[PDB]
Nucleic acid binder design. Structure first.
Length: 70
DNA sequence: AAACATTCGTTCACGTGAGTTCCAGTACAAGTCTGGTC
Protein backbone atom coordinates (compact mmCIF):
# COMPACT_ATOMS: atom_id res chain seq x y z
CA UNK A 1 0.00 0.00 0.00
CA UNK A 2 1.02 3.65 -0.08
CA UNK A 3 3.18 4.51 2.93
CA UNK A 4 1.22 4.64 6.16
CA UNK A 5 -1.89 2.82 4.95
CA UNK A 6 -3.36 -0.64 5.21
CA UNK A 7 -3.41 -2.97 2.18
CA UNK A 8 -6.42 -2.58 -0.10
CA UNK A 9 -6.00 -5.03 -2.99
CA UNK A 10 -4.99 -8.69 -2.94
CA UNK A 11 -3.66 -11.16 -5.51
CA UNK A 12 -4.47 -14.87 -5.36
CA UNK A 13 -1.56 -17.29 -4.99
CA UNK A 14 -2.72 -20.90 -4.57
CA UNK A 15 -5.24 -23.26 -3.01
CA UNK A 16 -4.31 -25.25 0.09
CA UNK A 17 -6.46 -28.01 1.53
CA UNK A 18 -4.17 -30.30 3.52
CA UNK A 19 -2.41 -30.05 6.86
CA UNK A 20 -5.31 -29.36 9.25
CA UNK A 21 -7.03 -31.84 11.55
CA UNK A 22 -10.80 -32.14 11.65
CA UNK A 23 -11.09 -30.17 14.89
CA UNK A 24 -8.96 -27.33 13.52
CA UNK A 25 -11.11 -27.18 10.39
CA UNK A 26 -14.27 -27.11 12.50
CA UNK A 27 -12.91 -24.26 14.62
CA UNK A 28 -11.84 -22.33 11.52
CA UNK A 29 -15.28 -22.80 9.99
CA UNK A 30 -16.95 -21.53 13.15
CA UNK A 31 -14.68 -18.48 13.26
CA UNK A 32 -15.29 -17.50 9.62
CA UNK A 33 -18.86 -18.79 9.28
CA UNK A 34 -20.46 -15.36 9.64
CA UNK A 35 -18.24 -13.57 7.12
CA UNK A 36 -18.54 -15.88 4.10
CA UNK A 37 -20.24 -14.37 1.06
CA UNK A 38 -21.38 -16.10 -2.14
CA UNK A 39 -19.15 -15.54 -5.15
CA UNK A 40 -20.64 -14.14 -8.36
CA UNK A 41 -18.50 -14.22 -11.50
CA UNK A 42 -20.39 -11.32 -13.08
CA UNK A 43 -19.71 -8.92 -10.16
CA UNK A 44 -16.37 -9.92 -8.64
CA UNK A 45 -15.30 -8.00 -5.53
CA UNK A 46 -12.88 -5.10 -5.81
CA UNK A 47 -10.64 -6.10 -2.89
CA UNK A 48 -9.81 -9.60 -4.19
CA UNK A 49 -8.32 -10.03 -7.67
CA UNK A 50 -8.43 -13.50 -9.19
CA UNK A 51 -7.33 -15.22 -12.37
CA UNK A 52 -8.89 -18.34 -13.89
CA UNK A 53 -9.40 -19.96 -10.46
CA UNK A 54 -12.27 -18.49 -8.46
CA UNK A 55 -13.67 -19.48 -5.06
CA UNK A 56 -17.16 -20.66 -4.25
CA UNK A 57 -17.38 -18.23 -1.30
CA UNK A 58 -15.20 -15.20 -0.56
CA UNK A 59 -14.44 -13.42 2.71
CA UNK A 60 -13.31 -9.83 3.02
CA UNK A 61 -9.65 -9.62 4.10
CA UNK A 62 -10.52 -7.50 7.14
CA UNK A 63 -12.19 -10.49 8.84
CA UNK A 64 -9.93 -13.34 7.71
CA UNK A 65 -6.97 -15.18 9.25
CA UNK A 66 -3.29 -15.60 8.41
CA UNK A 67 -2.02 -19.08 7.57
CA UNK A 68 1.51 -20.45 7.37
CA UNK A 69 2.21 -22.52 4.25
CA UNK A 70 5.14 -24.89 3.70
C1' DA B 1 8.62 -71.64 101.48
C1' DA B 2 6.77 -67.65 98.60
C1' DA B 3 7.29 -63.73 95.20
C1' DC B 4 9.40 -61.66 91.13
C1' DA B 5 12.30 -61.74 86.82
C1' DT B 6 13.65 -64.20 82.49
C1' DT B 7 12.87 -67.31 78.56
C1' DC B 8 10.43 -69.81 75.26
C1' DG B 9 7.09 -71.15 71.63
C1' DT B 10 3.11 -68.96 69.98
C1' DT B 11 0.37 -65.34 67.80
C1' DC B 12 -0.95 -61.18 65.01
C1' DA B 13 -0.01 -57.28 61.96
C1' DC B 14 2.60 -55.16 58.34
C1' DG B 15 5.87 -55.07 54.49
C1' DT B 16 8.02 -56.90 49.93
C1' DG B 17 8.66 -60.05 45.57
C1' DA B 18 6.54 -62.83 41.77
C1' DG B 19 2.48 -64.26 38.81
C1' DT B 20 -1.71 -62.87 36.12
C1' DT B 21 -5.23 -59.78 33.75
C1' DC B 22 -6.38 -55.29 31.65
C1' DC B 23 -5.51 -50.94 29.32
C1' DA B 24 -2.67 -47.04 27.26
C1' DG B 25 1.09 -45.78 24.28
C1' DT B 26 3.54 -46.96 20.06
C1' DA B 27 4.41 -48.62 15.51
C1' DC B 28 3.11 -49.61 10.84
C1' DA B 29 -0.05 -50.06 6.79
C1' DA B 30 -4.06 -48.90 4.13
C1' DG B 31 -7.79 -45.63 3.04
C1' DT B 32 -9.39 -40.92 2.03
C1' DC B 33 -8.99 -36.26 0.81
C1' DT B 34 -6.26 -32.62 -1.75
C1' DG B 35 -2.87 -29.89 -5.15
C1' DG B 36 -0.54 -28.87 -9.64
C1' DT B 37 0.24 -29.28 -14.64
C1' DC B 38 0.10 -31.06 -19.25
Amino acid sequence: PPPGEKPSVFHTLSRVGSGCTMKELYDLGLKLAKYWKPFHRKAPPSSILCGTEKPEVYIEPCNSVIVQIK
